[PDB]
């Protein structure tokens, strides 16, 4: 017997760090955790953990962690340990008061909005799926519109980028499936450091003949294990990708039958579409926007976009595609990327080889592509390349957008963003006066092969309103939830504008709930100051941090700060029950190992007790529009005067509120909805999230399944369909109808995802019901096609190269437009465009050993041991030019701030040859903050600009300009 584990209880958990979703085993003293290591039975990690997962014991049994809630009275220099009862009652008062004062029944136009604009909320992908959904509905029942989290400043561009392209915003395949690839391109990702267990499956791909390619400004621990490494200048992705489009078309490396049948190659674009010198048609200079109606397809009499299946018509998408990317020749791409013409051709040849029907190429990307003013268009370009090579829907193919936090997929799914309810049903605008007008926005299709599954939205919105308000008719309950103004850009309600408004005193109360915006928000100085102008900041986190203690950071004085900061110390993942949705949409149940530390509790128990006291206060006192608060179905969340993850999960899935007949099947009242297929609009069904419909059925909790048993067909691509549950309805690989010909025969029989026979689909769950060749394969698309031409995006239906808002070149070689013509910027804010003061490319990125702002990992001695201080990675050429020695203290400065870092001088960074001139970069980690540890350093976000993508408002944290100088 091993002494250490002899007297302890063994439970399963899921890692609280990255979205790989590795299994843990927690040994608990029969009652604190004595050991935490990997779960050898988990099909993703097989017992493996990176240093973050391997150190979860040091996090969970940490002596720097929050015991009992602290209260900071205004202008104070210190905390005071208060009780649960004080903390939740006083806060429930503060919410009620601030709401009552600023609650808007009708807007300036006279339209019903029923919202509070004085309260904002940030967070959090760190919370369980059950808690995330509860939190959003609580904030919305309180009338909040300014509801954001990690997703905004992470993969927010991925959602519209892939939804435009394929009809869903999620990672198309999953981790296990990478092993099936013939060519793995890792670009705008450092997967070996930031999704380490992913390289188990990347290396298994290579074992079976796959070529591994890393394209990155820096040579990384990923690059060390790849067959081909190529450098790329930060912000130069579209040139590279536009170059590969041209390359594929010229050399006829596209998958012809796939392109003709399954993409919108054949659709006829209207005559009003044009592009000249970096501007598409319909450009409005005065309002920094485009008239998208100029980009509309030519429609037949039935309203179905016209098609030329011979692909000969000059306004066919494929022919307009050839025309747009003809300017992206090897000489010009080389000149603007810094990537040699030889390496472009090497990478182009290797990846375009997967255009072959029985060969699969996949892309692994994350913040390298998203954190740009062209974030959406970066991703669009690669989605278009995958459609040309027929890599969407196939095993070892797809677009593997690597999600960040353990449950950022989940937290996005639960609509903790300003523009979406749970299940990607949009937040109503002021002109959606009724539920019928809301549903009327959903585009219809008169193509008999187009499934157009979003036509089912009325059933999901009605079942959602039933989940929240089960005694009200949906049409009635619709009036309770707040609405944004139709007149505004969406980006007015997003992160960067929420902090600009906070910096004008337009907010009273912020919830920094499982986020550290003092270090995690771009342009951190602005944020730290702006937060001074809150009347009450609430912070729910594991440790005291830079956010919860902003009032004393580099130059902060309680002499001039009046924020009633409340600090509510929460449980860690291993002390909590619930689910977390990983990058592949795998919804994984985890259990309580230890009891909670120092009388602290889960967010679900916090927020439910907190809101309950509001529900009680409004039952006693008066106050503005109290109907949304009183009527909330909250008893369905509970079992023993505490949050019931198990019951909240069953509500999300949903159950019949009465006896119903749906899809030629009889259902009894009270029993669970077996899939979103059986939801109704008439109030017969509730469902907190239609995506969760089928996750928790009568059969039990499918998220809790630990079954690695597969069929032969499933086993040769590693679907593991019996392990946990993935939305939608256990479709492990999205768009899998595209993996077969119109007879139902796999393109790659060796690696088949689905196969037709016995009049049914075998293997993965078919993504869209119907016999072979009777439906278009992208069921969530209006027209049913993979969109090469995507006219829904803010800056055009094709990706076009625009330099970062702070760039090292003065002239775009592709057009007369230097920057994104509709880019999100704030009026006044400065930009170093070839400024002599800031001549070097600035970028921020991660190391394996630290997590996010480092709030969690800067408290863990073993991770500080490995990476104790902020560093600054520079080439030998730049080190020479600035007289910097390896290990020297350097000062890195931008227009927005400056910091000190240890210089890592390395051959892993080299000059970028941009227009015959050598351009130098400065790399920084953003894992550090003033609070801990000693000499650790501050956030790199002191340097980062508060501008970026016009679609999603993601800040440009991967490409700006800086100076570096020796101290």
């Amino acid at each position: 017997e091993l002494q250490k584990l002899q007297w302890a209880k063994q439970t399963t958990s899921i890692c609280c760090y990255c979205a790989v979703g590795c299994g843990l085993i927690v040994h608990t003293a029969k009652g604190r955790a004595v050991n935490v290591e990997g779960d050898p039975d988990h099909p993703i990690n097989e017992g493996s953990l990176c240093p973050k997962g391997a150190s979860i014991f040091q996090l969970g049994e940490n002596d720097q962690r929050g015991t009992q809630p602290l209260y900071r009275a205004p202008f104070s220099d210190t905390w005071k340990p208060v009780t649960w009862d004080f903390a939740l009652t006083e806060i429930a008062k503060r919410i009620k008061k601030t709401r009552d004062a600023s609650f808007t029944e009708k807007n300036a136009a006279g339209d019903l909005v029923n919202r509070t604009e004085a309260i904002a909320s940030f967070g959090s992908a760190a919370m369980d799926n059950e808690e995330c959904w509860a939190y959003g509905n609580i904030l919305r029942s309180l009338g909040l519109v300014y509801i954001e989290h990690q997703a905004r400043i992470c993969h927010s561009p991925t959602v519209p980028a892939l939804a435009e392209s394929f009809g869903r915003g999620a990672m198309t395949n999953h981790w296990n499936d990478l092993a099936n690839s013939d060519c793995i391109l890792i670009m705008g990702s450092n997967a070996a450091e930031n999704h380490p267990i992913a390289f188990k499956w990347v290396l298994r791909a290579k074992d079976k003949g796959a070529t591994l390619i890393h394209v990155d400004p820096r040579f990384t621990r990923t690059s060390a294990r790849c067959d081909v490494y190529a450098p790329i200048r930060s912000g130069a992705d579209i040139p590279f990708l536009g170059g590969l489009i041209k390359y594929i078309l010229d050399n006829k490396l596209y998958f012809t039958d796939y392109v003709r049948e399954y993409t919108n190659a054949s659709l006829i674009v209207g005559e009003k579409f044009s592009f000249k010198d970096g501007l598409f048609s319909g450009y409005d200079a005065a309002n920094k926007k485009y008239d998208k109606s100029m980009w509309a397809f030519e429609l037949d009499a039935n309203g179905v976009p016209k098609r030329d299946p011979a692909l000969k018509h000059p306004r066919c998408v494929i022919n307009l595609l050839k025309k747009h990317y003809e300017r992206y020749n090897l000489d010009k791409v080389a000149a603007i990327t810094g990537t040699s013409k030889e390496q472009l051709q090497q990478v182009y040849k290797a990846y375009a080889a997967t255009g072959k029907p029985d060969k699969a190429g996949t892309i692994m990307y994350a913040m390298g592509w998203t954190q740009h003013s062209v974030g959406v268009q970066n991703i669009r370009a690669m989605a278009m390349i995958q459609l040309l090579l027929g890599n969407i829907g196939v095993a070892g193919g797809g677009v593997n957008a690597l999600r960040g936090e353990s449950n950022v997929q989940g937290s996005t799914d639960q609509g903790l963003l300003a523009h979406i309810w749970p299940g990607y049903n949009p937040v109503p605008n002021s002109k959606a006066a009724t539920l019928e007008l809301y549903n009327a926005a959903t585009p219809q299709s008169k193509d008999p092969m187009s499934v157009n599954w979003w036509q089912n939205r009325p059933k999901y919105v009605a079942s959602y309103l039933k989940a929240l308000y089960p005694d009200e008719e949906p049409a009635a309950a619709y009036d309770y939830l707040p609405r944004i103004d139709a007149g505004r850009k969406l980006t007015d309600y997003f992160w960067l504008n929420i902090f600009e408004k906070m910096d004008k005193g337009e907010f009273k109360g912020l919830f920094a709930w499982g986020m550290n915006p003092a270090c995690g928000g771009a342009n951190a100085n602005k944020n730290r100051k702006a937060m001074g102008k809150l009347e009450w900041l609430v912070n729910v986190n594991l440790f005291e941090n830079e956010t919860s203690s902003f009032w004393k950071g580099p130059g902060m004085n309680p002499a001039e700060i009046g924020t009633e900061v409340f600090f509510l110390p929460c449980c860690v993942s291993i002390e909590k029950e619930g689910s977390v949705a990983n990058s592949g949409r795998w919804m994984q149940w985890r259990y309580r190992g230890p009891k909670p530390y120092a009388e602290t509790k889960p967010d679900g128990d916090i927020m439910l007790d907190m809101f309950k006291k509001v529900r009680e206060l409004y039952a006693k006192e008066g106050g503005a529009y109290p109907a949304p608060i009183a009527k909330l179905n909250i008893a369905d969340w509970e079992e023993h005067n505490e949050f019931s993850p198990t019951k909240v999960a069953k509500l999300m899935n949903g159950y019949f509120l009465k006896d119903t007949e749906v899809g030629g099947k009889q259902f009894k009242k009270g029993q669970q909805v077996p899939s979103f297929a059986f939801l109704t609009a008439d109030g017969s069904t509730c469902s907190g999230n239609w995506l969760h419909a089928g996750s928790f059925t009568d059969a039990g909790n499918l998220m809790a399944r630990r079954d690695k048993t597969q069929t032969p067909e499933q086993a040769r691509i590693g679907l593991f369909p019996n392990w946990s549950f993935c939305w939608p309805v256990n479709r492990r690989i999205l768009y899998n109808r595209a993996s077969v010909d119109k007879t139902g025969k796999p393109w790659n029989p060796a690696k088949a995802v689905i196969e037709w026979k016995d009049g049914k689909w075998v293997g993965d769950v078919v993504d869209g019901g119907g016999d072979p060749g009777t439906k278009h394969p992208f069921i969530m698309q209006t027209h049913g096609f993979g969109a090469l031409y995507g006219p829904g995006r803010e800056e055009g239906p094709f990706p076009e190269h625009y330099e970062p808002l702070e760039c090292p070149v003065s002239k775009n070689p592709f057009s007369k437009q230097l920057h994104n013509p509709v880019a999100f910027q704030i009026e006044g804010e400065k930009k170093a465009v070839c400024d002599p003061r800031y001549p070097f490319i600035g970028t921020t990125y991660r190391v394996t050993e630290h997590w996010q702002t480092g709030l969690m990992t800067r408290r863990c001695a073993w991770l500080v041991e490995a990476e104790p201080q902020i560093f600054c990675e520079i080439s030998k050429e730049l080190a020479k030019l600035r007289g910097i020695g390896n290990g020297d203290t350097v000062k890195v400065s931008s227009l927005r701030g400056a910091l000190e870092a240890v210089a890592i001088v390395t051959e892993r960074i080299r000059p970028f040859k941009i227009e015959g001139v050598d351009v130098h970069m400065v790399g920084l980690p953003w894992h550090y903050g003033w609070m801990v540890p000693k000499n650790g350093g501050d956030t790199a976000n002191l340097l980062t600009p508060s501008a970026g993508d016009p679609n999603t408002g993601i800040p440009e944290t991967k490409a700006f300009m800086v100076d570096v100088r020796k101290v």
Binding site: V36, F57, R221, E865, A866, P868
Partner: protein
């Protein structure tokens, strides 16, 4: 006896093994600072039984050869560390005949620590400056005797770390070397007939670390 096969052609220097060693044993963290490298702790010590060494070798064209060496006791088949310690006091260094683990006891405090270290071809032993006890990798001998993998082997996501019986691992080592040569033609096994920690190097073992091989 037992054997590790360490395929460095698969190592991403994640340092999962470095943290996993300290977590299992509940070892303290060293005081460290960045001096222009990701390597930390910079060396093995009384409290650090495994550290991943980072070495950058210049290469013809873009990128480098980045060489990662998760260093540990080789648990030698005929350990010279025991030969030297036994000169001063038998029972300071002992051998498990079932597993093949070479184990330092607290009696090492009463032998010539400097001599025992110098006796190591791989420069593995480290002395506690206060108590003069010798510490290194103990092969997680307790886990192995209880039918578990060593903490650093179980944690490794890439397939770099492999563990099992001598015959099984030597066979795996020979088979893997043949496959790895197709990508890394200059690949070699480290002292495969002398040690129970058999490293596969992608090139000159000495480029990984000056004491990588004897």
């Amino acid at each position: 006896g037992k054997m590790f096969f360490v395929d460095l052609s698969r190592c991403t220097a994640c340092r999962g093994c470095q943290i996993a060693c300290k977590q299992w044993k509940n070892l303290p963290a060293e005081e460290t600072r960045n001096t222009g490298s990701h390597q930390n702790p910079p060396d093995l010590s009384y409290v650090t039984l495994k550290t991943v060494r980072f070495t950058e070798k210049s290469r013809k064209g873009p990128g480098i050869d980045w060489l990662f060496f998760p260093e540990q006791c080789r648990h030698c088949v005929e350990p010279p560390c025991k030969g030297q310690a036994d000169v001063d006091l038998e029972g300071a260094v002992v051998k498990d005949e079932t597993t093949g683990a070479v184990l330092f006891t607290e009696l090492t405090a009463k032998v010539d620590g400097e001599s025992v270290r110098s006796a190591c071809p791989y420069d593995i032993p480290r002395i506690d400056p206060v108590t003069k006890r010798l510490s290194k990798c103990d092969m997680c001998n307790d886990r192995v005797q209880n039918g578990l993998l060593p903490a650093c082997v179980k944690t490794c996501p890439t397939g770099t770390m492999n563990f099992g019986d001598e015959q099984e691992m030597l066979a795996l080592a020979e088979k893997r070397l043949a496959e790895v040569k197709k990508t890394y033609p200059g690949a070699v096994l480290g002292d495969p007939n002398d040690v129970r920690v058999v490293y596969l190097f992608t090139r000159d073992p000495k480029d990984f670390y000056e004491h990588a091989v004897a």
